[PDB]
């Protein structure tokens, strides 16, 4: 006939789309089945053998795909040596390195993946220790923890070294493996957010009892959650953040299938000093709350401590507003210069933060209704300011990540760079502050003043996201890209 | 300096992206807050005034935006007349029609939106009748139902007549309104899927009791759900499907902001006859199960009835397989020729169908464990075949929607057109069959044979999606586009 009149099976675009679609559908089926299995209560108690087989199978297929990659794509050296020996005096195909430079994720994202994977492996090892010291747990728990640790470590190495992967080899096998890795990461994320939700009920009940005794008369489970205090909450949010990052990186790698300067610390001083002041204030607040039992029990102090949190969030929000106003002078990007991975992860962190704040606000009101509204509304104000701050900061981060300093005025004068530096430092301090807040109720709020000024006790919902880490990574990318010479 | 060195506030692309981002964030915040409010148990019981205010506010802002559109964009006639009178002898700006032809959604999608919106308005009117006959309900329920009906009717008209909307007018106002409409539609969808989940617990408990008595010794709530039997389930899935379609249409309209043949029934006979045979078999099965109490109580019959369902799903799956094999000869699309709206809705229906089937399989096993595995595994096989059929059909629909008949052989001979016609007819019959299945447990499974062959009783989970309607719409689009002369 004419050109482009061949069967779609021979068309590279059509068959690439078909493999893409098949792998995506397979992932979707696995993720839905994993969610159904995890929620189901008859799979953790009765069908323990089936649940163990599913767990071992998910991690084992992940490890098999990782081994296939390391042997046949990333490091085909030993395979080439074996194939040469076979040809020498055994039998009578060779692979090539073909190393690439497709760095999918940002360096900050991969470093965070390393840190969170290490913390998750620490959590897995702690479970393993608990199940070793326990007789209730059996040999299958040992295998589950070991295979989880092995998969997590191998995926840490794969994520960090995701540039030397040449996905154009074994395209369909790599697509299926990437989708299985996404399914495994999402299944781990769902497992550990269901585990995090178990502590929500206990915290809620404890809060209701503590509230009542002070205002009266006017299906996944990890043993460390309820054994190692509230540190297990930090470990579990670390592992869910690691799983989210890994799933995003694997999705970027899977999407790439089939598709053919120096630190400029200039104009980063006034913001850096303000960021250091923010860090010093946050650290002083954390230390005063932690080491001084007298301070955490007084009402003056608990008022001042809550005012400190409100001031921190208000200062961050005002910094974002001033940054938008100053950076209004910048220029839009001439062409794309980023991966949607960072935006997607930041939006997921934003969703988690808004959910956390809304649940806290709902619990706060609930509690105030049960006490005839005798509680100061400062915790509600802190929650609302936190939600407004995270929303405005997400908008600011996206807008300024799509901004550049192209004009001569925007080059000699850097509008907002001080604000960007301050926001990056303050986001690191808010990350460590939110880590501390997960252990604030470990001290014990025996202070009646804590029931009327401290807002952490009202946040019984789990914090499933590290929005501050993703915000810091995006802000560092903005700082190093938006204010660059080009 | 040079070109493209102006502030991003003046850059049309940058400010369009900024308005897009702000409206998307606003929608996200509203949807998260709506989900938190609906799940919260203290908003339906204690904070009834706050819940009513939120309900009325969401629907009222939707209606205000709709009125603004109808007055100032779609039908600016009366506004022009008023503005002319003002200029005549009152004061001393005119709007223009600027009607467009941007048909966002498919005709089948808009017709389904009309049908489902009508059914949802019927459900709202039934509630209104119940609350009128009830003294427990107060005047606020009247207002809630009335405003829901008004919003649903206006959005029906807006969705059907979404071509004459010129979104390029009042770009930012229309963006905010489209995002508020998406938030309202998602909030309605979440409300009614939470309502559908309430019947899940009752059905599960009833199934456990009925199973036990036959094998012993070897936060949203709608009053019609538990009052009008299982017809309320059909009405509620109709309203959730309408809300999903409306949200998708509004998203397409919002995405369009800022961006500057005859029926060929040839070669559609053998498939049409097979589709008619499929319809006749399905209707005979439905009638025999409905009108004959003797048949629905016998074991021979209940076995044969389940075998009929298995045969229907197996025939549909085999039709999809044969269609892929035959249409392998077709040609890939030269360029895009569809809106992601249909693909997104089909994938959501697929997710819902897989969730339904997986929950049914989980319940089936659970039940068999409680009876020492004395139940035939036919219901599990039916569920598995249904899930496989829907997955394979989704893959087939997407692949063949990205296919064309460009070669001369693919023109004179139409590969798969018979299969496409048969699949469309059989999907209409499976739609009516799944509608019937929602009323199959209304008869009452007093037949012990129903507890061992009929698989509907094990599907205690709600069917939240009309996957068959979306499949029929996509298949009709394929039939009218893939096998066209061009």
Residue numbers in the entry:
A (entry chain A), B (entry chain B): 47 to 138, 145 to 270, 303 to 344, 358 to 583
What do the authors of the reporting publication say about this deposited model?
The otopetrin (OTOP) proteins were recently characterized as extracellular proton-activated proton channels. Several recent OTOP channel structures demonstrated that the channels form a dimer with each subunit adopting a double-barrel architecture. Combining the structural information from both channels, we propose a working model describing the multi-step conformational changes during the proton conducting process.
The WT CeOTOP8 was overexpressed in HEK293F cells and purified in glyco-diosgenin (GDN) detergent. Its structures were determined at pH 5.0 and 8.0 using single-particle cryo-EM. At high pH, the CeOTOP8 inter-barrel interface adopts an intriguing structure. The Glu325 side chain points down towards the intracellular side whereas the His567 imidazole ring adopts two alternative conformations. The His567 side chain flips up toward the extracellular side in its major conformation, forming a salt bridge with Glu325. This structure likely represents a transient state in which the protonated Glu325 is transferring its proton to His567. In its minor conformation, the His567 side chain remains downward-facing in the cavity and exposed to the cytosolic solution. Firstly, TM12 of CeOTOP8 forms a bent helix at low pH with a kink at a highly conserved proline (Pro559) residue, whereas the N-terminal part of the TM12 helix before Pro559 unwinds to a loop at high pH. The other structural change is that the residues 244–270 after the C-terminus of TM5 are disordered at low pH but form a helix that extends seamlessly after TM5 at high pH.
